[PDB]
Design an enzyme around this catalytic site. Structure first.
Site, PDB file in Angstrom:
ATOM      1  N   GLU A 150      59.123  15.812 -20.198  1.00  0.00           N
ATOM      2  CA  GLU A 150      57.911  16.269 -19.534  1.00  0.00           C
ATOM      3  C   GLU A 150      57.629  17.666 -20.001  1.00  0.00           C
ATOM      4  O   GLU A 150      58.547  18.432 -20.244  1.00  0.00           O
ATOM      5  CB  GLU A 150      58.058  16.264 -18.021  1.00  0.00           C
ATOM      6  CG  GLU A 150      58.367  14.927 -17.398  1.00  0.00           C
ATOM      7  CD  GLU A 150      58.622  15.058 -15.912  1.00  0.00           C
ATOM      8  OE1 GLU A 150      58.412  16.169 -15.370  1.00  0.00           O
ATOM      9  OE2 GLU A 150      59.034  14.060 -15.288  1.00  0.00           O
ATOM     10  N   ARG A 191      73.917   8.360 -20.381  1.00  0.00           N
ATOM     11  CA  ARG A 191      74.129   9.211 -19.245  1.00  0.00           C
ATOM     12  C   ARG A 191      75.198  10.305 -19.284  1.00  0.00           C
ATOM     13  O   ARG A 191      75.986  10.381 -18.356  1.00  0.00           O
ATOM     14  CB  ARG A 191      74.427   8.319 -18.038  1.00  0.00           C
ATOM     15  N   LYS A 214      65.604  20.157 -11.191  1.00  0.00           N
ATOM     16  CA  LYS A 214      64.647  21.269 -11.193  1.00  0.00           C
ATOM     17  C   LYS A 214      64.275  21.724  -9.796  1.00  0.00           C
ATOM     18  O   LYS A 214      64.111  22.908  -9.542  1.00  0.00           O
ATOM     19  CB  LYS A 214      63.376  20.872 -11.948  1.00  0.00           C
ATOM     20  CG  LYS A 214      62.232  21.884 -11.895  1.00  0.00           C
ATOM     21  CD  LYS A 214      61.028  21.338 -12.649  1.00  0.00           C
ATOM     22  CE  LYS A 214      60.129  22.423 -13.224  1.00  0.00           C
ATOM     23  NZ  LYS A 214      58.989  22.771 -12.346  1.00  0.00           N
TER      24      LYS A 214
END
Length: 709
Positions: free
Chosen positions: A238, A443, A453
């Protein structure tokens, strides 16, 4: 042997087309010489002969008039020392001159690039230049342009490059320009395609689970027209995201897999959601990728494709495989069997912004492996987009998006962490578009960190940590700030990496790897924090300290010579408990010892015992330098997330953290130092330069110690 085959079977064994080996027989001299060059090829090669080597021995036999030197030239072609047409074109003319047979090797070896290496990068650049220098003729003529010129210009910049490998670089860079002709082990060996049982490009249909429509074979054919069968892979963060140690696997596995296989790798920003630009973070990602050593082929955003996506969505509706729904927050929809023309109306209506956020939705009509019903394709968001602004008020969901985007970009290997996977194939097959293959690494995670975040941006608002940069953390930008060298992290995954499953590791293992290279990549100096003045009985009145103890080939530092040096208050004791209390020069016996109010030991005095046991670290004429020494952020090494019973995520916080320094005494060797270029204090261990250090007010971060136990 090989010297025992019919001339024709020898010549095919050197890999000549039979039709060329037929032609070659007829030539009773070339033939009989090539044959000999091939015997004494493996009389000194000891093995069967490489086909690459083959066309050289043929070339050699066919051109060398000076038979005398044939024994000589073979030996250089046998021990691949000569391995390209220009090298051999060179040595051949070297022998058309120089008829006398002293034949100094050095003169010879030098004028035939015997030692020379030519990096891919150098070819990329040589062709890239070549193309640019013709870019607009090349865009108009297209494939009717003279590809010869591109190889030519490319040639005369790389004298000893494999003529083939230039062509390949040309063939590709041209393709990208013009589009289709529409008429513990090593890392880049660990990631090679054939070493992983990954599918080769264009052969998706060999992978497990792959569905084959009656189109697949033509879709792959087009695919191959468009990519030339190149490995193409993505990396999709993102834009307002935060990268953490885990992503070092992501990054390496995507850019790595491309770099390791002549591939290319898009950096595709998942901006399907209209947010505002927290620029702090977006740039942090382009950096961090570079910083670990990779260069994105191209940087694309998913917003780039809203047009195409929307259009495909409409095509889903026509195939009665999606519908417009009016639910809210899995209970079945009253609306899933509503007629097609109705969903068509309201989708457009949804686009024209006739519906409030969430008053309507586009769902795909299916049920997924795990029983989830009609996942949502398109939602209605009214916040303005960072890149397409207010053009759109409907936007695809992640499910829908980063599956079709892989099709739009003809990803060959779509790699992602480890659920409902074959819901992947669902879209691309419903619409009959090209359909990439998804493999899943798993992972990587490390024991002592919190990386959400959300949870991170409140360690910065609850002053538990200095910035999202804070060395305490495991955000990449943080470990960079702790001066961890990229190469370490890249070596880290080298030692422990494949598609394992949620193999979340314990931190100290990493810092094994950070130090193994900091030991070689970081020079040394001296300093201590708990300092003390040390006067002394007079001395002679510039000592000279090592770069790298283990090897001196590097050229030592410049120190100063003064008799009022300083040293740690943690080596000088009163009552030995054997501990001690120099690194260069003498010994300097304690004569006088001070005191002041209390038992405070104000200063010291030293003899001249120049010319046993505990030596030490020291600093004359020192520089005043801040230092931050850090301790582990979270008390519970194990997941600080309610894994065991903490009951708090902000509860397991060792309030220790960091301990400010003096602006301590430091060595002058570390004076002309910019940030991030860490070296070693021979005392406690490895520190690195914080981005707060001007030329004057310098500052350091304690990176890592020298052992564990």
């Amino acid at each position: 042997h090989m010297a025992a085959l019919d001339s024709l079977s020898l010549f095919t064994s050197l890999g000549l087309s039979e039709q060329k080996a037929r032609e070659t027989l007829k030539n009773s001299a070339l033939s009989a010489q090539l044959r000999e060059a091939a015997t004494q090829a493996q009389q000194t090669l000891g093995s069967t002969i490489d086909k690459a080597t083959g066309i050289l021995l043929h070339g050699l036999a066919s051109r060398l008039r000076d038979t005398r030197r044939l024994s000589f030239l073979v030996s250089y072609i046998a021990s691949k020392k000569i391995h390209t047409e220009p090298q051999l074109s060179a040595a051949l003319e070297y022998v058309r001159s120089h008829p006398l047979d002293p034949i100094d090797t050095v003169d010879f070896e030098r004028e035939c690039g015997v030692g020379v290496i030519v990096t891919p990068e150098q070819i990329e650049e040589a062709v890239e230049a070549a193309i640019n220098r013709h870019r607009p003729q090349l865009l108009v003529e297209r494939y009717h342009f003279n590809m010869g010129l591109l190889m030519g210009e490319a040639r005369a910049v790389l004298k000893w490059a494999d003529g083939k490998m230039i062509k390949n670089e040309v063939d590709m860079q041209v393709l990208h320009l013009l589009g289709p002709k529409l008429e513990t082990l090593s890392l880049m060996e660990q990631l090679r395609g054939e070493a992983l049982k990954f599918h080769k490009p264009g052969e998706n249909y060999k992978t497990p689970g792959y569905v084959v429509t009656p189109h697949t074979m033509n879709l792959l054919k087009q695919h191959l027209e468009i990519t030339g069968g190149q490995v193409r892979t993505r990396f999709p963060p993102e834009p307002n995201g935060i990268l953490h140690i885990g992503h070092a696997k992501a990054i390496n596995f995507n850019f790595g897999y491309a770099k390791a296989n002549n591939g290319i790798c898009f950096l595709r920003f998942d901006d399907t959601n209209p947010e505002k630009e927290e620029a702090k973070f977006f740039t942090a990602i382009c950096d961090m990728v570079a910083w670990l050593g990779y260069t994105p082929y191209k940087v694309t955003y998913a917003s780039d494709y809203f047009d195409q996506l929307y259009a495909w969505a409409v095509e889903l509706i026509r195939r009665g495989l999606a519908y417009v729904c009016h639910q809210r927050g899995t209970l079945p929809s009253p609306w899933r069997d509503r007629p097609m023309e109705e969903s068509l109306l309201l989708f457009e209506a949804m686009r024209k912004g006739k519906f409030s956020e969430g008053e309507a939705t586009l769902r795909m009509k299916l049920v997924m492996e795990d029983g989830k019903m009609d996942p949502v394709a398109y939602r209605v968001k009214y916040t303005p987009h960072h890149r397409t602004g207010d053009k759109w008020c409907i936007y695809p969901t992640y499910d829908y998006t980063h599956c079709l985007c892989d099709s739009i970009e003809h990803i060959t290997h779509s790699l992602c962490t480890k659920a409902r996977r074959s819901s992947y194939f669902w879209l691309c097959n419903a619409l009959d578009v090209y359909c990439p293959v998804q493999w899943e690494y798993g992972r990587l995670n490390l024991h002592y960190a919190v990386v959400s975040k959300r949870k991170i941006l409140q360690l910065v608002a609850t002053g538990a940590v200095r910035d999202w940069d804070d060395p305490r953390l495991f955000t990449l930008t943080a470990l960079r700030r702790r001066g961890f060298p990229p190469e370490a992290i890249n070596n880290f995954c080298a030692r422990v990496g494949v598609t394992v499953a949620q193999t979340t590791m314990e931190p100290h293992l990493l810092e094994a790897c950070v130090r193994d290279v900091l030991n070689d990549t970081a020079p040394r100096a001296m300093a201590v924090l708990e300092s003390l003045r040390v006067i002394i009985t007079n001395f002679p009145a510039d000592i000279q300290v090592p770069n790298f103890p283990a090897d001196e080939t590097k050229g030592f530092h410049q120190v100063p010579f003064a008799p009022i040096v300083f040293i740690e208050r943690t080596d000088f004791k009163e009552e030995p408990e054997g501990f001690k209390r120099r690194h260069t020069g003498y010994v300097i016996e304690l004569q006088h010892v001070v005191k002041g109010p209390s038992g405070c030991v104000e200063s010291l005095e030293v003899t001249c015992r120049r010319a046993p046991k505990a030596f030490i670290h020291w600093v004359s004429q020192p520089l005043m330098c801040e230092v931050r020494l850090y301790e582990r952020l979270f008390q519970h090494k194990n997941p600080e997330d309610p894994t065991e019973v903490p009951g708090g995520f902000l509860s397991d916080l060792n309030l220790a953290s960091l301990h400010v320094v003096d602006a301590a005494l430091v060595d002058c060797s570390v004076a002309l130092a910019k940030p991030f270029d860490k070296f070693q204090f021979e005392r406690l261990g490895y520190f690195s330069v914080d981005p707060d250090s001007h030329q004057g007010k310098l500052v350091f971060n304690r990176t890592v110690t020298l052992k564990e136990d």
